């Protein structure tokens, strides 16, 4: 048996290798990005945005974020999904973005995911899996984004219910807002301190 290769921080320039356009490097013809909606993609379009804060309450302006999610019917565009259901064929389910160097805001254009089977016959509430990389972070931090308009499903969600300090479950619920026809979910992440966001070892 082998031991996993150890993690090391992404460092301050994680953009060169992961978002070359943000670093103004044009080497690739196809670039990976924060837009998961293709023209024929099914579901309700939503915009997910927020900021990541350090222990002084200051936003990280060098953070890199990725999300992984199911399609509108809660099927993952992955060979490991064993549901036997057909997934939306115009959906990658993943995206990547970095925070603006000045303001610290980050965002994704995606679709609100459908509910996915939980373990042993349970049903999970709609959620987006999110990971954070940055200088100072030795191992990417995993979290989840749930939706405040899904109170009923959230209450029965297996993962939220496995967090014994109930007061912290709320750090994982994004707030719905309706900006000019666009349904936006605001999700701020607090790495340390009060209202520190729950992080998972998955």
């Amino acid at each position: 048996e082998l031991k996993e290769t150890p993690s090391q921080t992404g460092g301050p320039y994680v953009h060169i290798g992961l978002l070359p356009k943000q670093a103004n490097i044009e080497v690739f013809e196809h670039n990976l990005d924060n837009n998961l909606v293709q023209d024929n993609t099914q579901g309700q379009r939503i915009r997910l945005e927020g900021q990541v804060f350090d222990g002084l309450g200051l936003p990280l302006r060098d953070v890199l974020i990725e999300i992984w999610q199911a399609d509108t019917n809660g099927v993952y565009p992955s060979q490991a999904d064993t549901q036997g259901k057909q997934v939306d064929p115009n959906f990658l389910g993943w995206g990547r973005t970095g925070a603006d160097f000045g303001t610290g805001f980050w965002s994704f254009n995606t679709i609100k995911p459908g509910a996915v089977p939980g373990r042993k016959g349970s049903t999970q509430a709609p959620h987006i899996s999110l990971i954070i990389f940055a200088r100072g972070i030795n191992i990417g931090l995993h979290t989840r984004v749930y939706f405040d308009d899904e109170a009923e499903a959230n209450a029965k969600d297996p993962v939220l219910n496995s967090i014994e300090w109930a007061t912290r479950r709320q750090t994982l619920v994004a707030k719905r807002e309706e900006r000019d026809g666009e349904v936006v979910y605001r999700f701020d992440i607090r790495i340390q301190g009060e209202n520190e966001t729950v992080f998972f070892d998955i």
Binding site: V27, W68, R119, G136, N138, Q192, F199
Partner: protein, 238 residues
């Protein structure tokens, strides 16, 4: 074969989040313990990237940004295998890399080091591992560089890498170093790793039989990801 969950990440084989010798970690590490969960379809699935989208020079950092001439520096090939902890090859994984040029300078807005910029070097590449888990890319060996942790801190030469493979649980970003670099023993970022055998797992080895005469040297570097266990009784994943 019916697959179950990924084996648990061994926290003792990785750096801790709070490591006061790496100063930036002091305000960017959670004070609460991570909450471990039992895996679901969300953690054992991951996206798929098609090779069709990749350009011919995406794994050739020597040529992919070359405009007027070749970049200055040591020509090297880096290759190896990606496997899971049970020894199975990791096929079609997305490997992305990025590094500084031969001066230790990154082509990044925020890098003002006096080491010279190279107009013919970009410093980023990507590849998909093949069916045997094998990957190979060509580049210029990066120079070490100074940074401000303590005022005179210097990182040993390194190449940053990222892997997106079969399961989200396997997601990993790290960096590898080069056999013999004396700065390896002084780096506070490498010392965040608890054990000596894990520090050594980040060192790429000189592969002399694979040097290409009158052309390039070669380093061998293998990567191990978390692996899934097979299920023979109850399958609780769903």
């Amino acid at each position: 074969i019916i697959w179950g969950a990924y084996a648990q990440r061994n926290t003792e084989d990785h750096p801790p989040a709070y490591a006061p010798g790496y100063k930036t970690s002091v305000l960017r590490s959670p004070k609460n313990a991570l909450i471990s969960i039992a895996e679901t379809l969300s953690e054992v699935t991951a996206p798929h990237f098609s090779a069709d989208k990749f350009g011919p020079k995406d794994n050739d950092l020597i040529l992919n940004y070359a405009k007027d001439g070749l970049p200055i520096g040591e020509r090297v090939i880096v290759h190896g295998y990606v496997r899971d902890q049970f020894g199975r090859p990791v096929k079609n994984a997305l490997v992305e890399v990025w590094q500084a040029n031969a001066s230790g300078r990154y082509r990044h807005p925020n890098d003002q080091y006096i080491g010279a910029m190279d107009p013919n070097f970009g410093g980023c590449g990507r590849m998909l591992t093949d069916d045997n888990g094998y990957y190979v890319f060509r580049t210029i060996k990066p120079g070490p560089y100074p940074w401000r942790n303590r005022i005179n801190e210097w990182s040993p030469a390194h190449i940053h890498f990222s892997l997106i493979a079969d399961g989200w649980a396997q997601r990993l970003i790290s960096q590898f170093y080069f056999e013999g670099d004396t700065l390896i023993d002084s780096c506070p970022i490498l010392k965040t790793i608890p054990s000596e055998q894990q520090r050594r797992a980040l060192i790429a080895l000189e592969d002399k039989s694979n040097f290409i005469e009158a052309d390039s040297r070669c380093y061998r570097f293998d990567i191990t990801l978390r692996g899934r266990r097979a299920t023979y009784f109850e399958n609780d994943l769903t």
